[PDB]
Design a protein around this ligand. Structure first.
Ligand SMILES: *CCC(=O)Nc1ccc2c(-c3c[nH]c4ncc(-c5cnn(CCN6CCOCC6)c5)nc34)cn(C)c2c1
Length: 309
C-alpha cells in the first residue's frame, strides 16, 4: 500500500522515533508557522516506564505545506538535537517520521506564553494596565518577577554557549510550565533566506520589529549581542506584566528614534537597578552590552535580595 507514503526521504533516528499509535491527540494549542500544534498524551515516551503517560505538544505539518516548510521543520528538529537539553528551553522529546504525516514532539508548557501569563496576573491599581483575563490568577511577588528574568537569561546563556542565536526573543516566545518554569521557544528555527517585511504582524498580532536591535533593524545583522538587546525589551515586558513595547510609537518611526537615542521609559513598578540593566542591554554599540553570562550572575544576586513579601 503506497497510499500516503511520503515522496520525501524523512530522517528516521532510532533514538527519537515514536510510533504514532503511542500518541493520543487532544486539544489544539494554536497555529504554528508550519501547521497546528496539538496537546497529546504519549504512552511509554520514556522506554524505562512504558506504561506511563506524558503530556506533550505535537507540532504538525499542514497538508498544503511546501517543500521549504518541510525542510525547515526538519532543520529545527535536527538543530534541537545538536543544541541539547536545558531546563529553560522547550526541549525536543521525539518525532514521528514514519507511517503518516511528520510530527515533531516537544515539551508541553501548560500555562502558555509568558505575555498572557503575566497579563492574567495583573493586580488592580495604578502601576499596571487592566487585567484582561476572565480567569485572573494570583499576583506574582517581586521575587517571582526577577526569577522569571533570571530563568530566561539562564536559558539564553545556555543557547549562546551552543552558538545558537535566537533572533526573536520576546515574551510571546517564552512558555510557562505547570511548575512555573520559564522555557524559551523557537530558538532552533532556521533563518529566512529572504528579506523580511517589517510591517507584517505575526498570526498573534505582534510586530517583531519592536524587539530588533538597531543593527538588525538597519543592516539585518543578528549576533548574541542583538539577542541581549531583545532581552532588554523582554525585561521591560516582564515589569509591565505583559505590556506592549514603545506605546504610541508608529513602527516606521522606530529606527529614527532609536538612532537618536530614544529608549523606553522605566515601568512604574521597576527598581532603578533593573531599569539600569534594561538600558545597558540597549546600548547603541553591540560590543558594550552585557553578555548573557553577566546578566545571569547579576540577576542571580538580585533574585536573592528581592523580597517575596
Ligand atoms: C514557526 C515557529 C512556530 O510555529 N513555533 C511554535 C513553537 C511552539 C509552539 C506551541 C507550544 C509548544 N509547546 C506548548 N505547550 C503549551 C502551549 C499552550 C498553548 N496554549 N496553552 C494554554 C494557555 N492557557 C491559557 C489560559 O489558561 C489555560 C492555559 C498552552 N503551546 C505550546 C504552540 N504553538 C502554536 C507553537 C509554535
Amino acid at each position: 500500500g503506497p497510499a500516503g507514503v511520503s515522496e520525501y526521504e524523512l530522517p528516521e533516528d532510532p533514538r527519537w522515533e515514536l510510533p504514532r499509535d503511542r500518541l493520543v491527540l487532544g486539544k489544539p494549542l494554536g497555529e504554528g508557522c508550519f501547521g497546528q500544534v496539538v496537546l497529546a498524551e504519549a504512552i511509554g515516551l520514556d522506554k524505562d516506564k512504558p506504561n506511563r503517560v506524558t503530556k506533550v505538544a505535537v507540532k504538525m505539518l499542514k497538508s498544503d505545506a511546501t517543500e521549504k516548510d518541510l525542510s525547515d521543520l526538519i532543520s529545527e528538529m535536527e538543530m534541537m538535537k545538536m543544541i541539547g537539553k536545558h531546563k529553560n528551553i522547550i526541549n525536543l522529546l521525539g518525532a514521528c517520521t514514519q507511517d503518516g504525516p511528520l510530527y515533531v514532539i516537544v515539551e508541553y508548557a501548560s500555562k502558555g506564553n509568558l505575555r498572557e501569563y503575566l497579563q492574567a496576573r495583573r493586580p488592580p491599581g495604578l502601576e499596571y494596565s487592566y487585567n484582561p483575563s476572565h480567569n485572573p490568577e494570583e499576583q506574582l511577588s517581586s521575587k517571582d518577577l526577577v526569577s522569571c528574568a533570571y530563568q530566561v537569561a539562564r536559558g539564553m546563556e545556555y543557547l549562546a554557549s551552543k552558538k545558537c542565536i535566537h533572533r526573536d526573543l520576546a515574551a510571546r516566545n517564552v512558555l510557562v510550565t505547570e511548575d512555573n518554569v520559564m522555557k524559551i521557544a523557537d530558538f532552533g528555527l532556521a533563518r529566512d533566506i529572504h528579506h523580511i517585511d517589517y510591517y507584517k504582524k505575526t498570526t498573534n498580532g505582534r510586530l517583531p520589529v519592536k524587539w530588533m536591535a538597531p543593527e538588525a533593524l538597519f543592516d539585518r545583522i543578528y549576533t548574541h549581542q542583538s539577542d541581549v538587546w531583545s532581552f532588554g525589551v523582554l525585561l521591560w515586558e516582564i515589569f509591565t506584566l505583559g505590556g506592549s513595547p514603545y506605546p504610541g510609537v508608529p513602527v516606521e518611526e522606530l529606527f529614527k528614534l532609536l538612532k537618536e537615542g530614544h529608549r523606553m521609559d522605566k515601568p512604574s513598578n521597576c527598581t532603578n537597578e533593573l531599569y539600569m540593566m534594561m538600558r545597558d542591554c540597549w546600548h547603541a554599540v553591540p560590543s558594550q552590552r552585557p553578555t548573557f553570562k553577566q546578566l545571569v550572575e547579576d540577576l542571580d544576586r538580585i533574585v536573592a535580595l528581592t523580597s517575596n513579601q
